[PDB]
Chains A and B, each alone.
Chain A
């Protein structure tokens, strides 16, 4: 209903935190609640921060891929930056990255960019996995990936950015996204020849 009464949800979250119920809830339930809170731009971030902190490392250790990506996406859309939640997220990603769908990979990459994630190994290996499975990427997934804030940071190697660029040239058909990708290629650290060829393909 896009209903915005944040006092009611604040009372509900206070009851959730006080009852120590965040240590027994399911991963998909946590993701659904966080996504619902983020979909309406919840105001009181202190309650959400306490609720996310209260959950234990046991839950973080064996979360499935999709609830985990939902949780990190809801964290990113709520402008939450937590130093100790992100290390748990990173080790869980290290464990279960191979099962991510392409749209999950794009969501993870752009959400981690949106929160200014400082780790580079996890980002680099996620980008490598995305490059390996480039032949299956849809249109919305490419928009989500190449629409990330610091996308040019991730376009480090030619191997990790060649199939993604050719797939974007083949599939993406929006002038603004192509211009943004060309600008990111210009600001990237790729070899000059590949940048020139990709810019030629995308624009013109």
Chain B
């Protein structure tokens, strides 16, 4: 290929004047056919990237620039499309600021100063917007996570004014984008939901999905619209997609739907076709079913069987919810539980502090986890992660490791020092540390003094059984401060004003000291 070799050489040496469209065409033919060694050759791609960086990318669409950048990144060249400036005074048009926002959204490089500038050049010319342009700019602003609620409210009012000129998809997209905006007013939301429910008989499944997402985001303040959509969709329940059924479950859990008659129908329809769900959708369906108190003997088995085919490659952020669901439910889940423990053992390296703490906490009281090899690995990993644990993640990890019988005095001492650095606010944030120390039953006297000084103010808000547990922990640790026992006895006196031998031995010993 003498001609091909010459062309490649001339491209490599940066001696060819390339336009943005030519680079786009070369990228497309390299990514589609790739009969030649274009992507495999590094020098040619480096030369093409050098030509693209110095070119004029205004003559290509944001999608084309994004595709060029993706093609360059697929081989290793760190490429990023240029940022377009705000149009000048003559080119200030409703169709150009929307283009600026669209390019900012597509290329995934958002500048808030540019957003403010194009939001201040849109207000004077806001009267020139087409009905669809408003529904486009609302979603574009929502996808940029803008915090300007007044502009979105004005846009929503205008969208309401041109109701008859908009399709169902535009109305649903405007509704969901409005629901995603945090600071928007509630009267506008009520008007939009009324508009949606008036034009609700034309909805496609995509519009159903958008409306369900909007309702879930808004919350249980909008029960009437959810009731209307539940009553309408009862005809389509059998012939319905799985994802929208999962969204129905999520909305049912969120709104606390007391009408448990249609919930059974929708749940049965979901469990019929639950085989066609991905990781996130299946996890959300599990959580929604648990929070609605729907896990029966048979549907739990089918959902667990569906989870089995996914448990091998679950994300580290989707292991704790399934463990919690299995823990709360009283049915048989030994096989799924073992697979999840194996996956957690595999993922122990990348697990963060919170996820590791949750995994340890769920398996604190699990009998089969006592002899499983995850205990030592998780203990070492928690000791490593102890610097990054928070006030609650540390407590969860300590509770899980103490309940599992993992014995390592150094880890519990370091946890005590970390807790002293953070400080304690609830008894549930201090008890796991005490039982972890009592597992080994040894600590320096300064640790005992600090623990007692933390416990003493907290003794005025403990139940009698918790006082018994605290006294047990303090006796095991070997405390001798008198004010702590004074406060404990003072609290005990209120519940049992009688010093009669009726109370157990520990109580008489406590009040004696």
A-to-B contact residues, CB < 8 Å: 2, 4, 40-41, 43-46, 49, 77, 79-83, 115-116, 118, 120, 150, 152-153, 156, 174, 187-189, 191-192, 196
Taking CB atoms, residues of chain A closer than 8 Å to B19 are: 2
Whether a CB of chain A sits under 8 angstroms from the CB of B93 is yes
Given the contacts A4-B59, A81-B132, A82-B130, A44 and B93 also touching, CB distance less than 8 Å: yes
By the criterion CB–CB under 8 Å, are A187 and B205 in contact?
yes
Whether a CB of chain A sits under 8 angstroms from the CB of B109 is no
Whether a CB of chain A sits under 8 angstroms from the CB of B256 is no
A202 to B503, CA, bound (A): 75
CB distance from A10 to the nearest CB of B (A): 8
By the criterion CB–CB under 8 Å, are B96 and A118 in contact?
no
Tally chain B residues at the interface, Cβ within 8 Å: 36
In the complex, the chain A residue whose C-beta lies closest to that of B98 is A79
A57 to B140, CA, bound (A): 34
Other A-B pairs, 15, CB within 8 Å; known A80-B95, A116-B167? A2-B19, A2-B20, A2-B21, A4-B59, A41-B59, A79-B99, A81-B133, A83-B131, A118-B166, A118-B167, A120-B167, A153-B169, A189-B205, A192-B276, A196-B276
Taking CB atoms, residues of chain A closer than 8 Å to B133 are: 81
Which B residues from 219 to 245 make CB contacts under 8 A with A? 239, 241, 243
By the criterion CB–CB under 8 Å, are A4 and B165 in contact?
no
Whether a CB of chain A sits under 8 angstroms from the CB of B136 is yes
By the criterion CB–CB under 8 Å, are B95 and A4 in contact?
no
A168 to B19, CA, bound (A): 33
By the criterion CB–CB under 8 Å, are B165 and A46 in contact?
no
A83 to B21, CA, bound (A): 31
Taking CB atoms, residues of chain A closer than 8 Å to B91 are: 43-44
Whether a CB of chain A sits under 8 angstroms from the CB of B58 is yes
By the criterion CB–CB under 8 Å, are B136 and A116 in contact?
yes
By the criterion CB–CB under 8 Å, are A152 and B96 in contact?
no
B-to-A contact residues, CB < 8 Å: 19-21, 32, 56, 58-61, 87, 90-91, 93, 95-96, 98-99, 130-133, 135-136, 165-167, 169-170, 204-206, 239, 241, 243, 273, 276
Q: What are the 7 A-B residue pairs with the smallest beta carbon separation, nearest first?
A: A118-B167, A45-B95, A81-B130, A2-B19, A116-B132, A43-B91, A45-B93
By the criterion CB–CB under 8 Å, are A150 and B205 in contact?
no
In the complex, the chain A residue whose C-beta lies closest to that of B136 is A116
Given the contacts A46-B93, A79-B95, A187-B205, A192 and B60 also touching, CB distance less than 8 Å: no
By the criterion CB–CB under 8 Å, are B165 and A83 in contact?
yes
By the criterion CB–CB under 8 Å, are A4 and B58 in contact?
yes
A29 to B205, CA, bound (A): 42
Taking CB atoms, residues of chain A closer than 8 Å to B58 are: 4, 41
Q: Among B59, B95, B135, which residue has its beta carbon within 8 angstroms of that of A40?
A: B59
Q: Among A45, A82, A156, A192, which residue has its beta carbon within 8 angstroms of that of B96?
A: A45
Provide 24 A-B residue pairs closer than 8 Å at the C-beta atoms, listed in order of the A residue. Answer: A2-B21, A41-B59, A43-B91, A44-B90, A49-B95, A79-B95, A80-B95, A81-B132, A83-B130, A83-B131, A116-B136, A120-B167, A150-B169, A152-B206, A153-B169, A153-B204, A153-B206, A156-B204, A187-B205, A187-B206, A187-B243, A189-B205, A192-B273, A192-B276
